[PDB]
Amino acid sequence: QTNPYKLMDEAAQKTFDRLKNEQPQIRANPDYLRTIVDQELLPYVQVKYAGALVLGQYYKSATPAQREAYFAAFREYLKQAYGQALAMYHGQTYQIAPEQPLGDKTIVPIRVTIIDPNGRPPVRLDFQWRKNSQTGNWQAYDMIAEGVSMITTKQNEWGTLLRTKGIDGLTAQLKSISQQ
Amino acid sequence: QTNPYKLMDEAAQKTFDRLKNEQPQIRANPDYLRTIVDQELLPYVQVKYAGALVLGQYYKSATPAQREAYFAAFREYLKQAYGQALAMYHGQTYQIAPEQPLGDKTIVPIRVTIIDPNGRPPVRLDFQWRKNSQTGNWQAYDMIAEGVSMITTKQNEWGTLLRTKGIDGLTAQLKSISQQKITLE
Amino acid sequence: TEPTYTLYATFDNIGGLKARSPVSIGGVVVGRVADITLDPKTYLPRVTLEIEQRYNHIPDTSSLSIRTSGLLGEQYLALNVGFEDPELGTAILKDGDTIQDTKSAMVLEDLIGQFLY
Amino acid sequence: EPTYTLYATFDNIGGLKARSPVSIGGVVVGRVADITLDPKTYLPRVTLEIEQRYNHIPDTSSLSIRTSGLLGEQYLALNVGFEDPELGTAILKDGDTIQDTKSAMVLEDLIGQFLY
Amino acid sequence: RTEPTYTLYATFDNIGGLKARSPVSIGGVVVGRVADITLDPKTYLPRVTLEIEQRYNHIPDTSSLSIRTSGLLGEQYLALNVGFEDPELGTAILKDGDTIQDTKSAMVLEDLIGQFLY
Amino acid sequence: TEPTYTLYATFDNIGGLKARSPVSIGGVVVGRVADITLDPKTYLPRVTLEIEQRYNHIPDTSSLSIRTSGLLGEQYLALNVGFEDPELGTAILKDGDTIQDTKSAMVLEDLIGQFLY
Amino acid sequence: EPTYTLYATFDNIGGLKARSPVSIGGVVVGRVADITLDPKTYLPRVTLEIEQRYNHIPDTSSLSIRTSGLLGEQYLALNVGFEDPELGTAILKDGDTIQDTKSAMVLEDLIGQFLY
Amino acid sequence: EPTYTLYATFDNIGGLKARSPVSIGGVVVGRVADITLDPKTYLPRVTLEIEQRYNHIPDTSSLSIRTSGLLGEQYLALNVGFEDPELGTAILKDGDTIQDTKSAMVLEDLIGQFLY
């Protein structure tokens, strides 16, 4: 890995193509895209920052095996929700932002866009790529859409619930959400 | 006969009756439903005031042939386009207003209500009865619902269209809307 | 000039229609209500209105209604002109008669709780 | 200006202040007197004054709270029901309390109900 | 405003909330003011007479009027719409003393609820 | 006025509930709010309030809440008294105790993201 | 009182007038110092200040912009961070700068995307 | 203080008055000069002023009209694009004209679009 734009472009085009060509197989069964999502896209993202940001505060007090089971169920929740969100295909093309070199940075935002003429005007998705402090391996974690986040709400809603019921309470809750 | 209350009661009775066993029949052809609508509803409605009220001031100048054609088109139109909310048939009881005698004037409002638990509160449908001046046989024409009317809107919308395109234009539009479509019943 | 008709009309609910407010026909002002009072026989309001003289050929079976302008204005009465035809219904509104048919007023809170429930 | 008094027990008064007009039909025929709290079960109690000139109403009336025009203060709305020919009816005397009731409405409850 | 101005006539059916003296603007720039409104003692319908500045004077006849609200609580102003003009074909020009064709109507928060699902 | 007696409460987001406001019950006002502050230990807000001397009987299973006034006004604490029941819940609010349950505030620009997106 | 200042970039001010209060969990700590523009990439830059008593917020916190009421004023709200052993830690010392941020929003985009 | 001038022809101006601010990003950099009709095709033309301290900007920017807050005035939002290495770019030399349009929005169109 080196220039994050390379990884972004290549992974995006490969994912779009792998979606498009195997779409008849998706029409064969709707309980199947999750394995492809976890096979191609997941190896490129990061996990620890997601749980680390959503948890917050309650980390000086922590139980090892409890953290293990939490990090476990977290990825099942995430994959299920993201695969459920995937189900919006109809056919539309993509475009990337104009390249701009820099280098001496760690946190760097980029943009993408998708468009379809016959139906509705385009939208504006984003991402958040982060340079690692250990080996320079760039990596992403967040996602933003027209001024709304996807981590801020999960940090703002699941509040007192943790403060009272218990970490294992949230673990059992997630384990329940693992099936929808 | 004389008291419109008895007419309203018998109308509610005969409407609630026989229409009940239509559950296998409603999913079939929703065409003969017009006939059942014609059965009891039509023989107590006055198309004449409906027409003479919607047509507006453009009546000091009119020809008999087009007049009769418009009246017939309006007859068939109101026949079709009345009865479509009947698809809401799921069962709900009816109740009448407390009786109060008078019988000295001509125009009289009444009331009615329908009750159905487990899904929204009841509504407040009304009517408007009028004592005829040719004999006294009361009859209805209007319909009201929570403030909104159902004949004022037609008097207020179809405006300049008549003023410009011509009465025959409205006749053509009504001919179009006569077989415009069939409800999803 | 003030050559006036005066007429009487009943209702059953009259929102916030205070006295001395204007009545309009088509979109122009042609006078104002004269007085408002109550009945000691059945507990229902009565309204006495007054009209100019130039307009004086209104057909009988007209109609009258209540409505509000803008969003935070003041309510007013809207008139509606009827029709003429022999045999069925005639009668020019002579001084001292009463407008017949009417419609009820609109209140809020009711429908906002009705739908979207 | 002779009048007389009545008592009512509500459930949650809402933003209704003290001293505000009553309304039958669409006119004004009284004014509310005082409001306090029951020191035995913690429910509000309200005293109302109406004109004696009207004195033939039945005993099965309701009572409710309304709003003015979008953003206007409140006023007690009343209603008149059916009176049977002297069977289960009578006349509100001078200390007989009304029975049925209906509360007010608050904002956040409706919003929270529309979602979740 | 000593500059001469030529007048026209228009007929509506429900002015809703107009008033004497208001600007009739085109595109978004003010031009002229409205002169007089009155009713017709013959079939009961309203009618308006308006002024137009003389510098602008080449309007094709196929045009239109409209009524419009301002802001969300502001009042009303007439709004003109200049239309198409085809060469060769007869279309003429608004010389003084004519009356333009089509129009629209006002809009008051009552008919909307009525047309809302009946 | 007459003496008072005070209590403590925690929260999570107090929106715009500033100092000095009524702690109404059912619909009548019965006291003000004393002091708000933050906890320099785990970063959470805390509030100390006072209640009049006259009412001296509240079952513990109660709750507080925050709500808006009208559609654009002030904000007032709203109390909710549960019920009394012998043998089971007997804790009488004496002095120097903290109500257990609580709720949060409500700010516009979070709803838009919560749903309708 | 001994204050200390920090620097942060953005993307859209969105009507955030200079000199306004920050907020951390509902309470007001400090105000914003000033705003300016960049002469190399055309982006705004904002310097802010903070009181010294609170002094342990871990680095990876967050900032955000929002509006109170329904149409009153608008301010910016902080979000306390997650404490990290082993990995990146770093107590914020004077003369540093906060990292990842977020951008404001305008209603017109939502109104347009809601009606297709 | 030194400035310079530019010309723009729109399509529908909306309630925009005169002498209103022209803002890039979130700060104020220009003020509008004058508005007049085109006595050849009847379309509006507007002259705008930009403070010359800023210079190195591309010649493919975009311009649009924006509303303020909820019920505030209006102003002119700008948008700066990218810049290729002197390939179809150049600098806005005193006296050129931007080449894009974006009219405002009025109420009745939305209602008619939503109710047909």
Author numbering:
A (entry chain G): 24 to 203
B (entry chain H): 24 to 208
C (entry chain E), F (entry chain C): 36 to 152
D (entry chain D), G (entry chain B), H (entry chain A): 37 to 152
E (entry chain F): 35 to 152
From the study:
The Maintenance of Lipid Asymmetry (Mla) pathway is a multicomponent system found in all gram-negative bacteria that contributes to virulence, vesicle blebbing and preservation of the outer membrane barrier function. The pathway consists of an OM lipoprotein component (MlaA), found as part of a complex with either OmpC or OmpF7,8; a periplasmic GPL chaperone (MlaC) which shuttles GPL across the periplasm; and an IM ATP binding cassette (ABC) transporter complex (MlaFEDB). MlaFEDB consists of four proteins: MlaE an ABC permease protein; MlaD a membrane anchored MCE (mammalian cell entry) domain containing protein forming a homo-hexameric ring that faces the periplasm; MlaF, an ABC ATPase; and MlaB, a STAS (Sulfate Transporter and Anti-Sigma factor antagonist) domain protein proposed to have a regulatory function. Specifically, we report the structure of E. coli MlaC in complex with the MlaD hexamer, in two different stoichiometries (1:6 and 2:6, respectively), stabilised through the binding of cardiolipin.
Masked refinement and 3D classification, focusing on one MlaD hexamer, revealed two distinct species, one with a single MlaC bound to a MlaD32-183 hexamer, and another with two MlaC molecules bound, with final resolutions of 4.35 Å and 4.38 Å, respectively. In the MlaCD(2:6) structure, two MlaC molecules are bound on opposite sides of the MlaD32-183 hexamer, with overall 2-fold symmetry. Likewise, MlaCD(2:6) has a Cɑ RMSD of between 0.7 and 0.9 Å in the core fold across all pairwise protomer alignments, except for those positioned directly opposite in the hexamer, which have RMSDs as low as 0.3 Å in the core fold and 0.4 Å for the entire Cɑ trace. Further 2D and 3D classification of the data did not reveal any evidence for particles with additional copies of MlaC bound to the MlaD32-183 hexamer, or for any MlaCD(2:6) structures with the two MlaC monomers bound in any orientation other than directly opposite each other. We believe our complex structure adopts a more realistic native-like arrangement than that obtained by MacRae et al. who used a multidentate MlaC ligand which likely promoted a non-physiological binding arrangement with MlaC molecules bound at positions MlaD1 and MlaD3, rather than the MlaD1 and MlaD4 directly opposite orientation we observed. The MlaCD(2:6) structure is also consistent with the observed two-fold symmetry for the MlaFEB components. The interaction interface itself is made up of predominantly electrostatic interactions, with MlaD32-183 forming a largely electronegative surface, composed of residues from β5, β6, β8 and α1 together with the β6-β7 loop, whilst MlaC features a positively charged groove that complements the negatively charged β6-β7 loop of MlaD, composed of residues found within helices α3, α4, α6, the β4-α6 loop and β2-β3 loop. However, binding to MlaD, between the β6-β7 loop and the main body could pull the GPL binding cavity open allowing GPLs to enter.
